[PDB]
Design a protein around this ligand. Structure first.
Ligand SMILES: [Mg+2]
Ligand SMILES: [Mg+2]
Ligand SMILES: [Mg+2]
Ligand SMILES: [Mg+2]
Ligand SMILES: [Mg+2]
Ligand SMILES: [Mg+2]
Ligand SMILES: [Mg+2]
Ligand SMILES: [Mg+2]
Ligand SMILES: [Mg+2]
Ligand SMILES: [Mg+2]
Ligand SMILES: [Mg+2]
Length: 74
RNA sequence: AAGGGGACCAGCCUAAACCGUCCGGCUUGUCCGGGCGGGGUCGUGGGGCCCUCGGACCGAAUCCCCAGCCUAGCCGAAG
């Protein structure tokens, strides 16, 4: 069963990553302890749109700060 | 059972794509979810979206009215 990790877990996976686990592990351990969520089609959109938004708010630093390396250095 | 002969006869509404709005979750937006409205309903496949040209008839199974009918009756030939 596929889940989306909310936290990095040793010898499991990294935060925001999709991993395969047995249904019982997800249902009786990971999910109740807030450590993951089901890789449902709803959640995969929400994860996507966060990975997307972080890359957006990153590039617009490396560009409006890059605009500063234009004024300075000249 | 098909098929044939007859009785009767009638076909519709949604879900999803997409659009709009309200509400709330936190994991902050191009988010996810819930409600309502729009859109849509099909097998010659149909629908959505985007271009392109083109602009009255239908009509309920709902509602209103009225014939008709039912729940009492009446007239009715000639020793
Ligand atoms: Mg027949
Ligand atoms: Mg008959
Ligand atoms: Mg018929
Ligand atoms: Mg809100
Ligand atoms: Mg939804
Ligand atoms: Mg929504
Ligand atoms: Mg909605
Ligand atoms: Mg088609
Ligand atoms: Mg009808
Ligand atoms: Mg009499
Ligand atoms: Mg008499």
């Amino acid at each position: 069963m596929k889940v989306i990790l909310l936290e990095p877990l040793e010898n499991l996976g990294d935060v925001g990553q999709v991993v395969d686990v047995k249904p019982g592990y997800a249902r009786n351990y990971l999910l109740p302890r807030g450590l993951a969520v089901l890789a449902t089609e709803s959640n995969l959109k929400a994860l996507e749109a966060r990975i997307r938004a972080q890359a957006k708010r990153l590039a617009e630093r490396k560009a409006e700060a890059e605009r500063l390396k234009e004024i300075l250095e000249n």
